[PDB]
C-alpha cells in the first residue's frame, strides 16, 4: 500500500519539534516582525490570481517550519497523497477508495477503481443533473396540476445537508428565482415550519440518503409525502414532486419516485465530502449548473495545486502543519474559523463535520491507541458578529485559539462604505491579536492623559493585551463559486494531511454507531406511559420524568 | 465591600481538589452507577414543576462534591451573591453596579443605586414598551402612507442583537402576525438582503445602541434611513418608522426619531445581560408584552432560587462547580451546549457572548495575572444536527468536552412520531457518552454478524467506545417564555459563580478596545489606492493586496 502507517511520535522530526518547543515556546510575534522586514513575503503564498494566504502571524520561525516539513517527509505524506488520488482503498476499515477528488475531476483523466475508470459514471450523473435542472429551473418540469416549480426542499442530515446549505447560503448573489429550503432535524419543528411556507403543487423535494433508510431523513421524507398526498391523492403524482439522491432503486421506486430521478453516488464518496456529487443537486437547482461547475472547477484547481506543489509552497500542507504545531505542541484544543462575510455564516459549521468527524479519532492505522492529540474542535461565527460576541476571550482569556480570518476584497453589495468598515476590522483584529499592547505602553498613555498612580495601578493590568495570539489571514478577490470551491477543497486537503501525519483513518466514522444502537432500543420505550427500568438510573430517571411531563 | 478577592489556588479547598484529582482522574461512570442505584436521585435537582437538571453523568463522587462546595464557601460566594443583588458596584474597573436582576424583579422589592430605588424607572420603561407595542401590533400605529406595520427590523450588535434574536427564534410558537428581522453585521450584505424582503410603508426599525454612536449599528441605521427616504421623501416621516433603544436623546432626535419612542436603560445593565431591558423591545413586538412578562418572571424565579437556596441544592452553583472541575482540574478547554430543539438554534451562540465575554479574562480582582484557567470556549449546534456533524469527535476523539444536553418533553409542533424519535436520541447519546461499549461487546456483535476471526481482530479497536464522556441533561416540560427565562438566568448565574471563584471581573470587557483603536487607524487608509507602509509587514501586505484586488 502507498499509504504508510508511521507513528509520528517515533520520528526524528517529532523529537526535534519537542526540543524546539521547549526552547522556543515563548516566541514573540512583535520580535519576529521587528527582526525580519521580509517576514510577510516569506510566510505567505498566492493561489491563482485571486487568493492570498498569509500565515506570517503564526508562532513559527524558520526552525519551526524546517522541522514541520521534515515531519511531513518522514511520515511519507507524498505517498499518501498519491494513494488517495489514484483510487487506492485508503479507507481500510471499510475497504473503500476515497475519491471526492474524482467528482470534480474536470480534466477527465482516468481514475481507476479495481482497474475500471470511474469518470464515465461521474460524468453521467453530472450530465443527468444538468438536464434535469434546466427543466426544473426553466419551468418545463410541471407539478401535478401543471404549474412550474417555485420551491425546492432538500431533506437530509449531516453530509446530505451541511454542504448544500452552506454553499447555497454563501452563493446567494448567484441564485436563480427558485426558493430552496433545507430540512435536516428529526425535530418535527424543522419540517413543520418549512411546510407552512410551501405549496404542494409547486414544490419539489429532494430526499438525500444513499441507503434511503436513514432514520431522520426517511421520517422527514414520509412526513413530506403524507402532506403532499393530502393535496394530490394519487401516489402516481409523487413522481413529479420527489427526487432521490441515492442508490437504493427498489426503496426509491417503492416511495413513488421515478428512478429516472434517482441521482446516484458511490461508496468512495464520503457523506462529509459529498456536496460535489449528486448530493449537490440542491446547489445546482439554486444557482444553476454553470455555477455548480465553477464550484467543481475551483476545487479541481486546488486539487492540482495539492498534488503538484512542493510542500514548502503547498497551501494545504502548510496550514495542516501549522495546525499540528498548535494542537500537538502548544496544546490548543480548538481552531476558530472567522469569515468576514455574512453569506459565509455556515462555513465554520460545515467544517465542524468535515474536520471533526474526519479526525476525531483515537485509534491509529495499526489498530493501536494514539498517545497524542488528534483532531481539534472547530468553531466560529462570521465577522463582525463573532467579533462582538467572543473576541474578549481570544484577546484576554487563558486559552490559545488559532484563528483563520477569511475575507473578500470586493463585496457583492456595493452599499456605501460598509465594506471598508468591515475590512478595517478584518485587518485590525489580526494586528491586535499578534502584537497586543504592553503595560509600558498603556501606562505611558494613562500618564499623558493625566491619570494618577492610583488610577494607573487600578486599571493598567486590565488594559494590557499580551498579544501572541496567532492567526492566518486568507484574502480572496471575491467570493465566487470558483473561489469558494478553492477554499473548501483547501480545507479538505488540510484535514487529509493532518490525518496522514497523525496516523489515523480520516474517512470512516465508527463513532456514530453506539448512539444509533441505543436510540433504537429506547424508541419503543417512549410510546406509552409505563415506567422504564431497563437502563442505568439516569437514563431511567430522565425517561420517567419525560413520561410524567408529557402526561 | 461584600465582594471579596480571594485567590482560589491558595485555598485549602483547591489544594484538596488537587489531591483528590490524583485518584479521581480515572473515575469511571459505569462503576459510579453500579456502586449506587440512587445515583440519579442524589445528583439531580428539580426546579419548580417543569424542569429537571440531571448532573449524575459527571465524573464526580461524594468527595468531589464536598470539596467543590468547600471551594464556593472558602471564596465567600455567599457574600458576592448578596453584593450583586443589593447593587454594590461590583464592576469595579468601570465603577458600576450589575443589576440585570433588577430588570426582572417582579417582586418590586427596592434596589438602590445612588440612594434611590431603581424599580420605578424599570417599571416605567416596561409600561412605555407595553403601550407602544400594543399600538404597533394592533395596527393603530400607522406608517407614512396610513398602513399598519407588518415588519420590524432590529439593528444592533453584540448584546443588542444576540439575545433578542435568540429569544424570538426560541419562542416562534408564541409569535404574533409581525415578521421580525435582525441585522447586526457591518458587512453590507446583512442590511441589503433584509431590505429586499421588506417594504418602506410597513416596516418599523429599532436602532439599538446606548450611545447612538456605535459604528456598525449607526452605519446600518443610516443605510436603512436612506432606503426609507428614497421611498418616503419627507424626513418628517422617519418618526413613524424608526424607534431607538438608547439614552442619547440629542443624537436620537437628530436622526429624526421622536424621543417619545426612545426607550432607555442604565449603566448597570451590561449589553450581554440586556435582553431583559428596553433592548428586548423586539421580543415584546414579536411575542407580545404578556409573553415578555412571563420571560421576566421565569428569570425572577431562578434569581430567587439562586439567592435563597443552600449551595448543595443550588442549580447554578452546582453547574458552575462541575464546570470548574473540568476546566481547572481535568484541563478541558471547552463546553458544548446541545439543545434538542431546532427553535433553540441560537442558544449556544448567545452564550458565546454571555459566557466568554464575561469570563475570558486573565487578570484577577487584585490586578494580578491569573495562574489558572478561566472561562471556557462555548460552542454547539442543536440536536440531532450537531449529532450528525461532530459527535464522532466527542465519542472517539482525544479531547474531553463536557456537554449540556437540553430538551423539552413536549414539542410545540404535533408531527407524527418525530418527537419520540428526537427524544430517543437525546436520552441515548448521554447514555452512550457515559458508558461506551467494550471490546468484548464489539467482538460478540461482529461474531454474530459472521465476520472471520481476522476481520474481527482488525476491526474491533475502531469500534470500541471508551465512554467516560460527561454530560448534564436538562429536561424541561416545554420551552415556554417562562422556562426559557429560567434557563437563561440559570446560565447567567452559573457564569457569575465561576467569575467569583476565579477571582476575576465578569462584567467588564476591556479586551474589546485594542481592535477598535486599530480599526479606526486603518479605516482612512482604505479610502485611496496608495500603498500602505505604516504597519507591520503582514498588515501592510494584506492591505496592499486588498487594494490591488479591488483595482
Ligand atoms: Ca532550536
Ligand atoms: Ca490545552
Ligand atoms: Ca480522598
Ligand atoms: Ca428564523
Ligand atoms: Ca436631523
Ligand atoms: Ca486541555
Ligand atoms: Cl513525503
Ligand atoms: Cl470503493
Ligand atoms: Cl468531470
Ligand atoms: Cl459504489
Ligand atoms: Cl440558474
Ligand atoms: Cl500531542
Ligand atoms: Cl444504575
Ligand atoms: Cl470509579
Ligand atoms: Cl451603576
Ligand atoms: Cl424610556
Ligand atoms: Cl401579541
Ligand atoms: Cl487551572
Ligand atoms: Cl412524545
Ligand atoms: Cl475464521
Ligand atoms: Na463494502
Amino acid at each position: 500500500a502507498m499509504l504508510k502507517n508511521i507513528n509520528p511520535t517515533q520520528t526524528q522530526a517529532w523529537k526535534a519539534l519537542t526540543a524546539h518547543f521547549e526552547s522556543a515556546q515563548d516566541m514573540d510575534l512583535k520580535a519576529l516582525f521587528a527582526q525580519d522586514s521580509e517576514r510577510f513575503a516569506k510566510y505567505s503564498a498566492r493561489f491563482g490570481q485571486d487568493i492570498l494566504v498569509d500565515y506570517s502571524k503564526n508562532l513559527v520561525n524558520a526552525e519551526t517550519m524546517q522541522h514541520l516539513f521534515a515531519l511531513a517527509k518522514e511520515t511519507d505524506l507524498q505517498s499518501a497523497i498519491t494513494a488517495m488520488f489514484k483510487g487506492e482503498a485508503i479507507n481500510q476499515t471499510e475497504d473503500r477508495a476515497v475519491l471526492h477528488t474524482a467528482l470534480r475531476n474536470r480534466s477527465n483523466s482516468p481514475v481507476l477503481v479495481n482497474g475500471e475508470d470511474v469518470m464515465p459514471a461521474v460524468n453521467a450523473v453530472l450530465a443527468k443533473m444538468k438536464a434535469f435542472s434546466e427543466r426544473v429551473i426553466g419551468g418545463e418540469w410541471k407539478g401535478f396540476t401543471g404549474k412550474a416549480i417555485t420551491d425546492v426542499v432538500n431533506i437530509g442530515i449531516g453530509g446530505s445537508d451541511l454542504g448544500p446549505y452552506m454553499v447555497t447560503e454563501a452563493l446567494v448573489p448567484y441564485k436563480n428565482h427558485l426558493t430552496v429550503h433545507f430540512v435536516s432535524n428529526v425535530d418535527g419543528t424543522h419540517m413543520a415550519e418549512t411546510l407552512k411556507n410551501v405549496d404542494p403543487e409547486t414544490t419539489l423535494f429532494l430526499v438525500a440518503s444513499k441507503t434511503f433508510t436513514t432514520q431522520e431523513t426517511m421520517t422527514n421524507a414520509h412526513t413530506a409525502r403524507d402532506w403532499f398526498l393530502k393535496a394530490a391523492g394519487d401516489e402516481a403524482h409523487v413522481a413529479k414532486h420527489f427526487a432521490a439522491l441515492s442508490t437504493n432503486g427498489k426503496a426509491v421506486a417503492e416511495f413513488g419516485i421515478d428512478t429516472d430521478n434517482m441521482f446516484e453516488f458511490w461508496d468512495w464518496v464520503g457523506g462529509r465530502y459529498s456536496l460535489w456529487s449528486a448530493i449537490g443537486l440542491s446547489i445546482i437547482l439554486s444557482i444553476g449548473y454553470d455555477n455548480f461547475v465553477e464550484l467543481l472547477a475551483g476545487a479541481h484547481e486546488m486539487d492540482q495545486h495539492f498534488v503538484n506543489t512542493p510542500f514548502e509552497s503547498n497551501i494545504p500542507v502548510i496550514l495542516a502543519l501549522i495546525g499540528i504545531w498548535y494542537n500537538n505542541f502548544h496544546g490548543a484544543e480548538s481552531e476558530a474559523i472567522l469569515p468576514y462575510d455574512q453569506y459565509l455564516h455556515r462555513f465554520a459549521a460545515y467544517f465542524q463535520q468535515g474536520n471533526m468527524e474526519s479526525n476525531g479519532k483515537y485509534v491509529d492505522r495499526n489498530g493501536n491507541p494514539v498517545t497524542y492529540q488528534t483532531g481539534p474542535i472547530i468553531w466560529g461565527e462570521p465577522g463582525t458578529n463573532g467579533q462582538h460576541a467572543f473576541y474578549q476571550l481570544i484577546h484576554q482569556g487563558t486559552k490559545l485559539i488559532p484563528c483563520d480570518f477569511i475575507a473578500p476584497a470586493v463585496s457583492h453589495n456595493l452599499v456605501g462604505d460598509h465594506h471598508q468598515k468591515l475590512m478595517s476590522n478584518f485587518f485590525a483584529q489580526t494586528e491586535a491579536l499578534a502584537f497586543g499592547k504592553s503595560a509600558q505602553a498603556v501606562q505611558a498613555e494613562l500618564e499623558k492623559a493625566g491619570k494618577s498612580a492610583a488610577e494607573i495601578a487600578a486599571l493598567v493590568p486590565f488594559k494590557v493585551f499580551e498579544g501572541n495570539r496567532p492567526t492566518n489571514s486568507i484574502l480572496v478577490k471575491q467570493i465566487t463559486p470558483r473561489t469558494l470551491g478553492n477554499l473548501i477543497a483547501m480545507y479538505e486537503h488540510k484535514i487529509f494531511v493532518q490525518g496522514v501525519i497523525w496516523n489515523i483513518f480520516s474517512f470512516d466514522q465508527w463513532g456514530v454507531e453506539l448512539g444509533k444502537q441505543l436510540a433504537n432500543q429506547i424508541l419503543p420505550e417512549l410510546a406509552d406511559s409505563a415506567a422504564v427500568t431497563s437502563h442505568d438510573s439516569s437514563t431511567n430517571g430522565l425517561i420517567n420524568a419525560f413520561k410524567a411531563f408529557r402526561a
Side-chain angles (χ1 to χ4, degrees), chain A:
Chain A
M2 295 196 73
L3 175 63
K4 311 305 188 301
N5 298 345
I6 297 164
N7 179 336
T9 65
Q10 295 178 343
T11 66
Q12 300 294 117
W14 191 276
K15 295 174 187 173
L17 285 160
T18 296
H20 174 55
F21 184 80
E22 172 59 27
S23 54
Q25 56 191 104
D26 298 328
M27 198 186 300
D28 180 83
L29 285 166
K30 178 179 284 290
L32 292 170
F33 280 84
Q35 293 169 17
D36 181 15
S37 62
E38 293 293 306
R39 187 173 171 88
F40 164 81
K42 293 175 182 174
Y43 292 81
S44 64
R46 301 288 301 206
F47 174 85
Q49 294 183 338
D50 296 347
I51 302 184
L52 166 63
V53 178
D54 178 358
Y55 55 95
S56 69
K57 300 193 192 78
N58 281 294
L59 306 173
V60 300
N61 64 17
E63 171 171 10
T64 325
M65 298 310 299
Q66 176 176 163
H67 299 317
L68 287 168
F69 294 125
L71 178 60
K73 319 321 292 288
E74 199 164 357
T75 55
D76 206 353
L77 176 59
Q78 188 59 52
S79 188
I81 294 174
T82 302
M84 172 167 68
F85 279 83
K86 74 186 300 180
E88 173 174 308
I90 64 166
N91 173 357
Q92 297 173 12
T93 69
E94 299 182 316
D95 189 25
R96 295 173 178 174
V98 173
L99 286 172
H100 46 278
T101 55
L103 296 172
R104 64 238 193 175
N105 177 26
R106 307 306 296 170
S107 81
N108 283 150
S109 54
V111 178
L112 309 179
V113 173
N114 300 321
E116 299 187 3
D117 188 6
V118 303
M119 296 308 304
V122 167
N123 291 148
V125 180
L126 287 172
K128 188 179 167 180
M129 291 193 295
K130 174 187 181 289
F132 176 76
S133 74
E134 291 174 357
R135 294 166 65 193
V136 177
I137 297 165
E140 288 178 321
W141 180 281
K142 305 301 184 184
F144 79 99
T145 68
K147 300 181 176 180
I149 300 301
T150 60
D151 293 82
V152 177
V153 179
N154 191 73
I155 306 174
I157 64 170
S160 303
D161 167 73
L162 292 178
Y165 182 49
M166 179 276 280
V167 169
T168 58
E169 287 295 298
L171 302 177
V172 157
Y174 298 87
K175 77 188 295 299
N176 59 37
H177 70 94
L178 293 176
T179 300
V180 187
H181 311 256
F182 293 84
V183 178
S184 59
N185 207 329
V186 69
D187 176 0
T189 292
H190 216 192
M191 182 62 77
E193 292 288 345
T194 300
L195 295 178
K196 293 177 198 306
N197 294 329
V198 298
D199 174 356
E201 297 176 36
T202 54
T203 303
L204 171 66
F205 294 91
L206 311 180
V207 185
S209 172
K210 209 289 178 55
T211 59
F212 223 65
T213 59
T214 306
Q215 195 184 144
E216 301 74 10
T217 299
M218 299 315 300
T219 296
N220 279 321
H222 286 115
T223 291
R225 194 188 189 270
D226 289 349
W227 171 90
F228 173 76
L229 291 173
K230 281 179 58 186
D234 188 341
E235 295 184 3
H237 300 313
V238 169
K240 289 179 176 171
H241 296 272
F242 290 77
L245 318 178
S246 181
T247 64
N248 189 344
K250 181 175 180 178
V252 170
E254 177 58 32
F255 188 96
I257 292 165
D258 179 334
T259 53
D260 289 351
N261 310 126
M262 183 176 72
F263 301 88
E264 299 177 348
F265 58 112
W266 306 275
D267 285 351
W268 42 256
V269 179
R272 63 191 171 268
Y273 298 96
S274 73
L275 72 81
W276 317 100
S277 73
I279 292 294
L281 183 55
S282 59
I283 301 167
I284 294 169
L285 292 168
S286 180
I287 70 177
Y289 190 74
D290 285 348
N291 287 322
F292 185 74
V293 165
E294 282 285 305
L295 178 77
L296 295 176
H300 184 60
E301 291 177 333
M302 183 57 64
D303 292 342
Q304 290 171 317
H305 168 86
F306 180 54
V307 167
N308 298 316
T309 310
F311 298 164
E312 293 74 15
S313 54
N314 191 311
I315 292 163
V317 176
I318 293 162
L319 298 177
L321 291 169
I322 291 177
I324 288 165
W325 179 235
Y326 299 130
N327 186 68
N328 294 94
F329 297 88
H330 284 263
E333 292 181 22
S334 82
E335 286 180 321
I337 301 177
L338 308 170
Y340 274 61
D341 190 77
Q342 187 64 34
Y343 292 130
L344 284 167
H345 68 115
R346 306 308 297 164
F347 190 81
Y350 175 81
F351 283 106
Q352 289 182 318
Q353 184 176 13
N355 200 315
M356 302 172 71
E357 194 174 62
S358 296
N359 292 341
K361 304 289 168 62
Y362 81 103
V363 183
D364 73 23
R365 292 196 286 276
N366 293 314
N368 298 315
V370 299
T371 56
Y372 47 90
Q373 286 297 317
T374 61
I377 297 162
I378 301 307
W379 64 286
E381 286 287 346
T384 52
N385 308 343
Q387 180 179 313
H388 298 299
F390 53 75
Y391 284 27
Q392 165 67 50
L393 187 149
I394 304 180
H395 285 281
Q396 290 191 327
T398 62
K399 276 74 181 173
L400 175 65
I401 303 164
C403 295
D404 282 2
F405 280 70
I406 304 170
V410 182
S411 180
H412 288 275
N413 295 291
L414 306 180
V415 189
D417 59 13
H418 283 261
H419 203 64
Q420 284 178 15
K421 288 167 171 168
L422 180 67
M423 298 298 289
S424 71
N425 289 283
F426 170 83
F427 301 125
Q429 287 290 334
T430 64
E431 187 184 20
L433 285 166
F435 309 116
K437 187 178 185 175
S438 72
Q440 296 191 20
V442 175
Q443 179 168 337
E445 291 189 6
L446 294 176
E447 286 175 343
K448 188 184 186 65
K451 308 311 183 187
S452 67
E455 290 181 296
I456 284 169
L459 193 54
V460 168
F462 302 104
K463 297 186 76 173
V464 170
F465 288 76
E466 291 188 316
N468 295 320
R469 270 58 181 173
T471 57
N472 290 312
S473 290
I474 297 173
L475 184 66
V476 188
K477 184 179 187 179
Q478 186 161 48
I479 304 302
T480 68
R482 183 175 290 260
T483 60
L484 182 61
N486 294 155
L487 292 171
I488 299 167
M490 182 191 71
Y491 283 112
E492 290 180 339
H493 296 321
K494 178 192 175 187
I495 291 159
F496 175 73
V497 172
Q498 295 187 323
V500 170
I501 296 178
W502 289 324
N503 199 23
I504 57 171
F505 286 122
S506 295
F507 302 102
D508 57 22
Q509 56 284 319
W510 295 107
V512 307
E513 294 200 328
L514 181 57
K516 177 178 177 180
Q517 180 71 359
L518 298 183
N520 288 339
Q521 294 294 322
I522 289 169
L523 182 59
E525 300 176 329
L526 306 183
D528 67 27
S529 69
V532 168
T533 58
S534 57
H535 310 270
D536 61 279
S537 69
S538 172
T539 305
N540 292 340
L542 288 162
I543 291 169
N544 291 323
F546 159 80
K547 292 190 180 201
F549 282 147
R550 182 173 68 172

